[PDB]
C-alpha cells in the first residue's frame, strides 16, 4: 500500500468509494507507522493498540479470495462497514466471514442506490447506517 | 541494529533534531493537492531560514516529530502540534444526536 | 499523629496526577506477599508457619510446632498463639522442632519477629547448621579473640563480638545429643 | 566497489555471531543469577509486613536511589528507571522535600545528572564486578546513614519473569524520625510488639531500620542484575535479527552487485573483439 | 535431454502413459546450450548465459505437458550457481517448475 | 592498514610467505618463533573482531594477555630505515638476526 | 571441515578409521557453531563449553608436520585417544605433543593388528584402551 | 535457552504434536528394501490426508 500509486486514476474513481476510502488509506498510513515502530511486543501504548486493531480489522477487510470479483457498489459498503464502527465487535479472524455477513444481510436495495446515485447520499448514509447495525456478526 | 537505547544523550539530540529537520524539509505541493488532498504551501526564503535556525538551536524540541511533516513554515508546526495534541482528547462522541435518525 | 494517610494504594492515584500518563505505576514489595502481620488465622492449633531467613537462603518456610530462638535475655521458645514479639537475638542456635525431628542451626545473631497472626519470622545473616561448624579453629581464635584488647573502642566491640559468638558456639557443640 | 560491499558482510556476519554469543552470555548469567534472587526475595517480606509500605509519606530529608547497570547493552533498562525516578522525585515532592539522589551502577551517573544534578550525591558503581553479596550492600547502606534522611527510596526492576520487569519503589522509614509517627493508630500498631531487646524500642528500631535498608538494598541490586541479563537476552535477539535483516539486504545487494560486474566484464571482452573482427 | 524427451514422447503419444522423466540437473542443460552458443560465436547475454537461454530453455520444458494422450511429468534437479536464486538460469528455470522438492541434510 | 596504523615497514606479517620458512632450513628455534608470532598476530586479529564492537573486559584474561602480547609483537616489528632518517626523522637501526629471535 | 567434502564419501574409508571419524565430524560440526564464541571465557554455560573445548582437542589433533606422512594405523589409533576421551587430560597447548606421547609408547604390537584386521574389532577395543592409559601424557 | 519443560502447556501441545508429524512424514521405500529389511510403503492419497 505505501509504494503502490495511481494518480491518474484518482479523482477519477468510484465517488462513494473515494469517500470512504480517503480515510482507509489514512488509517492504513498510519498503521504502517505503528508498525514500524512497533517490531516487537513489549512496549503497549493502548493508543497504538487502537491502530493495531483498525490496521488489523482493515488489511482483513481488503484480502479477497480469487476469480470472484466483487462489485463497486458492495466493495463501497464493505469499506464503509470497516473505517467507521460496525467490525470492532469481531476480533480479527471472522472479518472475511462478517464481509459476506454484511453483504448478505444488508438489503440489496441499497445497493442500486449507492450505484444509480454513485456517492454515499445523506439519505443513504443515514439508511446504510441503520442496515449496518441489525446485522448479525459472526464475533460474538 | 543497537537501537537508540545505546545512544550517547548529546547523539540522542542528534538523532532527535535531526528526525524533526528530515520532516520540516517536506512540503505539500499545490500541483499535488489534485491527489494528496493536502493544499499546497508556498514558503518565503525568510521563513524557512528562520524555521530550521529555530531547530537547530533548540527552540521547538518541545513539538514531536510529525508536526513537522507536510507542513508549510514554523507556525504550522505549532498550528499541527495543537491538532494532534487536541485529538488526543477528542476521539468519542459521536453517539446520539444525528443528522441519521429516521424521520428528519 | 497519623497526618500522612500513606501506603501502596494511596499513592497509585497520587501518582496518577503528577507522573506522565504512559507509564503504569510502580510495583511495591507489599504486591509480593501474601502473608500479612495482623491477618487475623494462619495458626489452625499446634504448628504454626516459621519463615526462617537468610540474605543468600531460605532455610525453612514450612510450618513448626515449636521454636527455640536465642533472645539477647535468653533462650525463649515459641507456641502457636504466642505474644507478638520483636526479639533481638544473640549468636545461639535457633532450634526448629515440628515433632520428634529436630534440626540446630547456629546463627549469627540478627531478629527474630512473631506477630500478631502467629507467624514467626527469623531475620539472620549466617545461619550455618552445627555439622558444618569445625570444634578445633573456634578456640584457636576465641583464645586470640581473649587476648587482644586495644583502647580503640571501635575494635573493642569487635572483639567484644568475636568472644560471646566463639562462648556461645564452643557452649553448643560441648552438649551435643 | 564490489569490495566495499564484501567487506560490510564480513562486518554484519561477525556482528550477528558477537550478538548471538552474548544473547545466550546474558541467557546464562540470567539463571545462574535466578538461583540468587528467589533466595534473596525471603528476608524482604517480614519488614514489609512488620513496617508497612508507606511510599507516600512527606519526610523532610529523603535519600533516593536508582540502581542501574555497570555494562550498557541492557535496551533501555538503565533509562526506564530514569524516567521513573523524577516520576516518583516529583509524586513525593509536596512541601519542599530535601532529596539526595543516589546512583548504584556507572549507567546511572551519566543519567539522573542529564534529570537531576543538584540535589545529586553518591554514584555507586562496579558492585556487580564479582557478585553482590550482603556485606556489600552493608556498605552501601552503611553511607546512607551518614546523611540522616527521614525517609529512603530504592528505585530498582523487579525481576518477574525474563520477559517483564516491572519497576518498584521500595521506602525504608527512618526509625522513630518518621517511621513510628505512620504506624501511630489510635494508639499504636507497633505496641502490639513485645521487644526483647537489650536497650529501648527507640535504639533496636535504630538497628532494625539500617536492617530493612541493607536487605532491600541488597534485594534491589540483586533483581536488577538479574533484569539487567534478562533484557539484554531481549536486547541481543533484536539485534541478531537486525544483523540478519541487514545481512540479508546486503547478500541481495551483493549478488546485484556479482552478476552485474560478470555483465560488465564481458561486454568490455565483446567489445574489443568485435573491434578487430 | 531432448534424446530424453524424444523416449518419454514415444511413450506419452503413442502408449498413452504417465510418464515421468528426470533431467538430472537442468542446470547443466544450461551451462551446456551455452557453451554451444559461446563456441557459435554468439553474443553472450547477462551474466554471460547465452542470448536464447529463455527459449533454448523453454523449448525443452514445453514438450513436458500433459496432451489428450497421456502427459509426461519431469522431476529436474535443479543447481543453484552462486547460491543465487536471481541468477538467471535458476530464475529462467524456476518459471516453468511447478513444484519444488528440497532435500535437506 | 599497517601502513595507517603508523607501524612502518608496512608488511602484512601472516601474508608475507617465504619458502626459508621450513624448520630444517632455518632451524627450529627460528621457525618456532615465527610460527609463534604469527599465531598470537592472528589471535588478535580474530578477538579485534570483538574488541572493536565490546572492549576487552570480558575475554578472561586469557585472551587479554594475547591482545596485549601481539600489541608488543606488532610495533616490535616496525623498525625506523636507514633511508626514512628524511621521512621519519628518527636514525635507522640495523637489527641482527640473532637479535631478532631473541627479542621476538 | 565445513566446506571440504567428498560426494564418495565412507564408503571409500579406511574401516577402522570409519568408526571413530564419523563421530569425529559429528563432534568438529557441532563446535563449529560454537566456534567464535571461545573468547567468552568467564562467560561459560557448562554444555556449550563441553563441545568447546572437545572441539579444540580435535583441531589440534590433525595438525601434521609439513612432509610427515602417518600411515593409516597410526593416524586412527591417535584419533581414537582424541576422540573417545583419553585426551581430556592434555591441556589445549600441548596435544600437538601429546599424540607422540600417545604413538611412541602404545607399543607397536597393536598397529600390525589394527593395519591386518582393517577395523577395531571388541578384541582389539578391549586391548588399546588399556594400552592407551599406560602412557605419559604432558598432564598438570 | 529457557527450558524443555519451561513454556506453556499449549506450546508443548504443538511440539509433542509436531514431532509425531515430523517423524510420520518418514515412510519405507519399496525400492530400499533389498539394503535396509523393512518392507516398502505405498501410501495412498485419501489415507495421507485422512491419516494426518
Request: overall charge negative; aromatic content about 6%; hydrophobic content about 40%.
Amino acid at each position: 500500500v505505501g509504494l503502490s500509486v495511481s494518480r491518474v486514476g484518482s479523482a477519477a474513481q468510484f465517488p462513494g468509494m473515494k469517500q470512504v476510502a480517503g480515510t482507509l488509506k489514512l488509517e492504513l498510513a498510519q498503521y504502517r507507522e505503528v508498525a514500524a515502530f512497533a517490531q516487537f511486543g513489549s512496549d503497549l501504548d493502548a493508543a497504538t493498540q487502537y491502530v493495531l486493531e483498525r490496521g488489523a480489522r482493515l488489511t482483513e477487510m481488503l484480502k479477497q479470495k480469487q476469480f470472484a470479483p466483487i462489485p463497486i457498489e458492495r466493495q463501497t459498503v464493505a469499506v464503509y462497514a470497516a473505517t467507521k464502527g460496525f467490525l470492532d465487535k469481531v476480533r480479527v479472524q471472522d472479518i472475511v466471514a462478517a464481509e459476506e455477513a454484511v453483504i448478505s444481510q444488508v438489503n440489496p436495495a441499497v445497493f442500486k442506490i449507492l450505484k444509480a446515485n454513485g456517492k454515499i447520499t445523506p439519505a443513504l448514509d443515514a439508511h446504510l447506517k441503520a442496515e449496518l447495525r441489525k446485522v448479525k456478526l459472526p464475533g460474538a | 541494529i543497537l537501537g537508540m537505547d545505546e545512544l550517547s544523550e548529546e547523539d540522542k539530540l542528534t538523532v532527535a533534531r535531526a528526525r524533526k529537520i528530515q520532516r520540516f524539509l517536506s512540503q505539500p505541493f499545490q500541483v499535488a493537492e489534485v491527489f494528496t488532498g493536502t493544499p499546497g504551501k508556498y514558503v518565503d526564503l525568510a521563513d524557512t531560514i528562520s524555521g530550521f535556525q529555530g531547530v537547530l538551536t533548540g527552540k521547538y524540541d518541545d513539538l514531536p516529530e510529525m508536526a513537522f511533516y507536510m507542513v508549510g513554515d514554523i507556525k504550522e508546526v505549532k498550528e499541527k502540534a495543537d491538532k494532534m495534541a487536541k485529538d488526543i482528547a477528542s476521539r468519542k462522541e459521536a453517539d446520539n444526536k444525528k443528522v441519521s435518525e429516521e424521520l428528519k | 499523629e497519623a497526618a500522612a494517610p500513606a501506603g501502596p494504594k494511596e499513592f497509585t492515584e497520587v501518582w496518577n496526577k503528577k507522573a506522565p500518563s504512559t507509564l503504569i505505576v510502580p510495583e511495591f514489595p507489599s504486591n509480593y506477599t501474601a502473608v500479612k502481620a495482623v491477618g487475623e488465622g494462619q495458626v489452625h492449633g499446634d504448628a504454626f508457619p516459621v519463615n526462617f531467613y537468610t540474605p543468600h537462603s531460605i532455610l525453612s518456610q514450612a510450618q513448626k510446632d515449636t521454636v527455640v530462638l536465642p533472645g539477647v535475655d535468653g533462650y525463649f521458645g515459641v507456641k502457636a498463639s504466642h505474644v507478638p514479639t520483636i526479639a533481638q537475638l544473640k549468636p545461639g542456635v535457633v532450634e526448629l522442632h515440628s515433632g520428634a525431628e529436630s534440626e540446630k542451626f547456629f546463627v549469627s545473631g540478627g531478629f527474630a519477629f512473631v506477630h500478631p497472626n502467629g507467624v514467626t519470622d527469623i531475620c539472620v545473616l549466617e545461619a550455618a547448621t552445627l555439622d558444618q561448624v569445625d570444634p578445633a579453629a573456634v578456640k584457636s581464635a576465641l583464645a586470640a579473640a581473649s587476648a587482644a584488647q586495644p583502647t580503640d573502642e571501635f575494635e573493642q566491640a569487635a572483639n567484644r563480638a568475636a568472644i560471646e559468638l566463639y562462648s556461645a558456639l564452643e557452649s553448643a557443640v560441648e552438649a551435643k545429643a | 566497489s564490489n569490495q566495499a560491499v564484501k567487506q560490510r558482510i564480513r562486518a554484519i556476519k561477525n556482528i550477528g555471531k558477537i550478538t548471538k554469543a552474548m544473547k545466550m552470555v546474558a541467557a546464562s548469567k540470567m539463571k545462574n543469577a535466578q538461583i540468587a534472587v528467589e533466595q534473596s526475595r525471603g528476608l524482604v517480606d517480614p519488614f514489609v509486613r512488620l513496617f508497612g509500605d508507606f511510599p507516600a509519606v512527606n519526610s523532610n530529608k529523603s535519600v533516593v536511589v536508582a540502581v542501574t547497570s555497570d555494562k550498557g547493552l541492557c535496551g533501555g533498562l538503565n533509562s526506564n528507571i530514569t524516567k521513573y525516578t523524577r516520576a516518583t522525585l516529583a509524586t513525593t515532592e509536596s512541601e519542599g522535600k530535601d532529596v539526595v539522589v543516589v546512583s548504584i551502577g556507572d549507567k546511572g551517573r551519566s543519567q539522573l545528572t542529564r534529570i537531576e544534578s543538584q540535589r545529586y550525591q553518591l554514584a555507586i558503581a562496579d558492585t556487580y564486578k564479582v557478585r553482590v553479596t550482603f556485606g556489600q550492600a552493608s556498605l552501601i547502606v552503611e553511607e546512607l546513614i551518614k546523611h540522616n534522611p527521614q525517609s529512603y527510596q530504592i528505585l530498582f526492576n523487579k525481576f518477574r519473569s525474563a520477559i517483564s520487569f516491572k519497576p518498584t519503589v521500595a521506602t525504608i522509614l527512618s526509625p522513630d524520625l518518621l517511621e513510628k509517627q505512620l504506624e501511630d493508630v489510635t494508639g499504636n500498631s507497633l505496641d502490639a510488639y513485645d521487644i526483647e531487646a537489650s536497650h529501648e524500642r527507640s535504639d533496636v528500631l535504630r538497628d532494625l531500620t539500617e536492617f530493612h535498608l541493607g536487605v532491600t538494598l541488597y534485594n534491589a541490586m540483586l533483581e536488577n542484575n538479574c533484569s539487567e541479563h534478562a533484557s539484554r537476552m531481549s536486547a541481543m535477539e533484536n539485534s541478531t535479527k537486525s544483523a540478519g535483516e541487514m545481512l540479508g539486504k546486503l547478500t541481495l545487494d551483493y549478488n546485484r552487485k556479482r552478476q552485474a560486474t560478470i555483465t560488465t566484464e564481458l561486454i568490455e571482452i565483446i567489445a574489443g573483439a568485435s573491434a578487430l573482427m | 535431454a531432448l534424446t530424453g524427451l524424444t523416449v518419454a514422447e514415444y511413450f506419452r503419444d503413442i502408449e498413452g502413459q504417465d510418464v515421468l522423466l528426470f533431467v538430472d540437473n537442468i542446470f547443466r542443460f544450461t551451462q551446456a546450450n551455452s557453451e554451444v552458443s559461446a563456441l557459435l560465436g554468439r553474443i553472450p547475454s547477462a551474466v554471460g548465459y547465452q542470448p536464447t537461454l529463455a527459449t533454448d530453455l523453454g523449448g525443452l520444458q514445453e514438450r513436458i505437458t500433459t496432451t489428450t494422450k497421456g502427459s509426461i511429468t519431469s522431476v529436474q534437479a535443479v543447481y543453484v550457481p552462486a547460491d543465487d536464486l536471481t541468477d538467471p538460469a535458476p530464475a529462467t528455470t524456476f518459471a516453468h517448475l511447478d513444484a519444488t522438492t528440497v532435500l535437506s541434510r | 592498514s599497517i601502513a595507517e596504523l603508523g607501524i612502518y615497514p608496512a608488511v602484512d606479517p601472516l601474508d608475507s610467505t617465504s619458502r626459508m620458512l621450513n624448520p630444517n632450513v632455518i632451524g627450529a628455534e627460528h621457525y618456532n618463533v615465527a610460527r609463534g608470532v604469527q599465531k598470537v598476530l592472528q589471535d588478535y586479529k580474530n578477538l579485534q573482531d570483538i574488541i572493536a564492537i565490546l572492549g576487552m573486559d570480558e575475554l578472561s584474561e586469557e585472551d587479554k594477555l594475547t591482545v596485549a602480547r601481539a600489541r608488543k609483537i606488532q610495533r616490535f616489528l616496525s623498525q625506523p630505515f636507514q633511508v626514512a632518517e628524511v621521512f621519519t626523522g628518527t636514525p635507522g637501526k640495523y637489527v641482527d638476526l640473532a637479535d631478532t629471535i631473541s627479542g621476538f
